[PDB]
């Protein structure tokens, strides 16, 4: 129950010719940019509170340690968003983004909507490197602004570093995004009615994208509760290690798993995006 | 595209594998770093690397581990090939008494598709050399002489070693069972 | 920011004299009963599908492996609920429940409402051993039935083994209980308006009780959105290892952490429940 | 018109050597296991509804009283299936099943198909005690699963306690099984074309097995409506009290009655199954 | 959950004014006619076979003892139908039928269709005593014959004594009428789509009318499987002893139970039929 | 109620501790099973047990590990006290040559309150005995003789051993630093 590269290529091409394919890009898409972890950044900020960096990492997950900065030392949480903006959007990360085959193969296609969950600017900046125009959508003021219909709309699903109050990084902020009331969430509610999604750069043990995968399936079934049940467009999830139990769970959430070649991570994602063209 | 993926971290174990199974179109190669279990028993270690390596790569994986059991050391080094190599490179031919030299070199493969593990074990009986002799091998190949020869593993060529080493008979068994 | 046994004893006693203390019992409360794990039970059922038991456990969490039985082999999921009912409610588990000081100290108090998240019958059966009456509340038909006001109402928050369609054990069933629409959820919505909760038998890395801890705090703040902000009754969480970061997070979720003595787990919980008397 | 033990022994042996004998086991086969009645269990559950146990039994048959729980208090019907699973499949019932000569003589023969109408697991567990493999077949998912040809297939004709939605115990469920549309019914439609049946453990006043005895005869006569009428294999029914009118009725339903010795019920059934060997 | 006489009288009157009430008359309707039992008649015919009359009754139910005559001594079964025709339709039974208030109150109403399950002629003969015309419908030749639209059609659901091959009295004949393929059964399949039924003269322990009560409900639910579920006309069952569990079962089979006064059986049925007028 | 909790799994290490620090009201005792890291360096192992034991108990914990470094084996077993004891109980006095017998017994404590780890290390220089002599000790106490004496650890009493053993000077340092 797992597609290969050559099997999924005519399936993705059929969704793209009629304009109904939306990429949903994760943290693994920014892997060739050699960015800092963030868990390494939050551990070095804990030295001022008396923590050793390996000892502060012991006390919980990354969003739980950021919860601790949000309530006990709020000036260090703003310091964390500050030095991620210097690191994730540095000039060295732009130079790797110029030569990355993943970001070139993404920008070679005329997308209409691109979703991403990472905070850096390298999804839009890939489109600017190809001479294309992109519109960042993170806050209410971004949706209200005018733009042309030719422009690909890049929705920052968890905020952008240039609008620091849109960042979803604290554990309490992840829990209140489960109600789906943010402006990126309301845009997702209308796009799942018409489109198929291509999830790239996630792991099966994320537990946040798994709730989104569940909740998208529940909103598709709820949208056809009184009418006869019609078949929906199939979503996709590109993986390098699919496993043996998790692809069967994802079938019932309207998502087919695509096994990519695990020898070179960045090349096999680039061959997937070039087979859509 | 491959079906089975061989996970290794040693750069010389990879070069000997690709001399034998390099032409097979259905064997891939991965270099994921997995946390090595430390135990004396080879059957225990190779069976625990396959769980630890399947968690890392999530594809049908093949792992490998070696052993060197010396009668003078009562089975040591054993599968603890890591902590002795980081302490006694080839000075291990000095720390054992010169009267009794006999030992066995042992190797083990384990392939895991996710549902079940299968362990292959070969073994070569030999005796440890008085001094380190040779360059062409890995981890104890200059100080191990098989039974019958006068010549160590690292003094042999690559074709001569794989007709005596435990890892040479395993790779022929791995070809016929997995159909590589 | 962590209470001890003697510091929390007058705080719990003040809530109990005016009838506003509700225990919320977890899986660690059934620890002295020597029950099977359930993850061990689901691994032995996977032998018929060709899995080794250590290999089937590798492919995900326990609720994710139960998701796999719910969609690929539904007769093995009903087999799992069957042999948990033979194991969790066996005669050997009742005999340990007679002599357990945790279950005796729980039943020595005249509670009005007890919440529990585990499937076995040993919360009510502790009350039956003390000669007291208990009313199990898991489904809609349980709430509709008549009972006296003297009877302690034990709400099975995740179902009961004698009503197998109420069991919350599949991963999709955990995700749809996050909307809080079940009859145990609607009872929780009214009890958080008036009561304080005593959480016993959980870990900080549960990620399901953490959403409940978040969502209870959000429903308290939402219930006083137009009126002036008044101080609510404080909830409590008894732990044997509190850590160093997690008790500060729980303070903002209206929950004080009680450090119990970690040398004997079962005795220190029993000294907590006897200090309320 | 009634066979004895020695007269029916070469008749049963001839059907068994060519693999065309299927046992059809009733509630009297689980009589030495000292199980609770079920009518006693449903009467004690009626105390919560205000019934005395002797008064609740007055208002109808057992399947009619279970109809009353299915529509007026559905949580007590699931309680009934729960505490039959604790009682019929207890460890005390397994220990009597080890030493029962009926269950040992059943498992000493290499059967191909065994039918049973009782809910407990002691027909398969007799085969597991003899070191033989058995395959339980109750639901659609059981038939779809793979198995070897050596394995004896035990079809639960009225469901199994580990699959509680397959239980045929409500009166309305008995009436809708008269249409013969369940997966155990469709398997029976093909097995009556080729096999002879050995009915053990029923009474003449059952009125449910009498409809099955009628309907099997009607399906044999319907299967040869256009061709010349050929003689079918004779079925058998082992009894301890045959009576005087009922064996003549059963002759026209292709069933010969075997009079067993009524002094010891369990021994005379065991001598019947050992004469087949 | 049981109607009285005065409560059910406007409910029956509303169904009768629009012509959608059909009586379904049982053996208790012919109780004031002082007819022989039939079980007494079949026991006295067994004296020629060597049976004592109390001993022949021991070996089974009445339809099972008639099965024994159908296969072992067929000339005595035709003797039984012969001397029921002399006894049930005698001149003494007609004289009691003249003065019976049940039969006068039945014939005082302009019915369109009357169903009955008893073999005697006293349902039509009640209509002939009131100067009204009746059409007996038992066989295929009866339906094919011509008649006027004013004439009340009396369908003999189990045959008539003047057409002895239509009699449903053998046990095998009761089992093959469960498939509903007889001409009275095919007429019942169309009348349940439009009408409400008034069942008079049955017991709750009949087990033949209970299958008919089940199967009518199943055919109503099957007739609205694709359309939205609309509310059907309610059927009725007049009883002198309703009990306590059986009226709740009948509610789910679209049948309301009417408790009549048990002091005088015949008078309370007559007050029911006169309240419809 | 205690403030610091000593986590150990050996039943004889616990009996020697409670002979010294048993009267302290602010030291508790836990027996949580933690996964032992295997390495030759004692500083590496004791610093990694404190993370692994704080994750298990989540209270301010104190851990302990020992070492036996033999010159003949080039610092072996070192901190690998588990895989040699499961293979060479006291036959380890046989597998080393009889000319050079010198060795050091080393011990290490590490206490971790959650924010920072502090490592205490003592050391006793001695020489391995020709044969196993004595009963009163644990893991190599019959075959280790300190410098100056003629008598092994297991031939000594409990008060005599803790005035020579590395674990005796550590428990006096642990009293004064933690205020036990």
Automatic annotation (TrEMBL), chains A, C, D, E:
The lineage of its organism: Bacteria, Pseudomonadati, Myxococcota, Myxococcia, Myxococcales. InterPro entries: DHS-like_NAD/FAD-binding_dom (IPR029035). This is NAD-dependent protein deacetylase.
Automatic annotation (TrEMBL), chains B, F:
One of its GO terms (biological process) is nucleoside triphosphate catabolic process. One of its GO terms (molecular function) is nucleoside triphosphate diphosphatase activity. InterPro entries: ITPase-like_fam, RdgB/HAM1. GO terms for cellular component: cytoplasm. Keywords: Hydrolase, Nucleotide metabolism. The keyword Ligase does not apply. It holds the Pfam family Ham1p_like. Belongs to the HAM1 NTPase family. This is XTP/dITP diphosphohydrolase. It comes from Archangium gephyra.
